[PDB]
Symmetry: C3
Subunit: 59 residues, 3 copies
């Protein structure tokens, strides 16, 4: 009569065919770090190489 079961495991999931499924499997796991976190990293090493960018300009 009622569909909810109230599943509590601290885990996150979506509504699919009347089933609770970890969205992470469709997000692509990696903590999701591999989508977001790399972009943040690139700037950091790339930015320290600017000392060479103005070097040409100033001299």
């Amino acid at each position: 009569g009622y569909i909810p079961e109230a599943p509590r495991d601290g885990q996150a999931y979506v509504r699919k065919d009347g089933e609770w499924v970890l969205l992470s499997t469709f997000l692509g796991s990696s903590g999701n770090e591999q989508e977001l976190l790399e972009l943040d990293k690139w700037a950091s090493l790339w930015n320290w190489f600017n000392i060479t960018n103005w070097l040409w300009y100033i001299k």
Copy 2:
């Protein structure tokens, strides 16, 4: 007895430990623009530099 509250705020959220939580916090916000939208941008400037790619080939 019943778990649903019917929360309406135009916002989107997932089922976690019996709580409605904004999936955006796990998507990584930025509108999500910073995952998708950059990829689309790279092509654009990179593509305008093709005039130099055939230049070598043709001459």
Copy 3:
């Protein structure tokens, strides 16, 4: 009185304003391949170019 309808289509969706909405539209579709799958690809061609990296070092 009750909000659930039990929609079964094998498709996945989130809870928004009391409506079932395909999270894919907010994920950015592409199978999501275009967020995850490219990163995996870059390594592959980039890694085959290492034969040139040690070449300088060894000679």
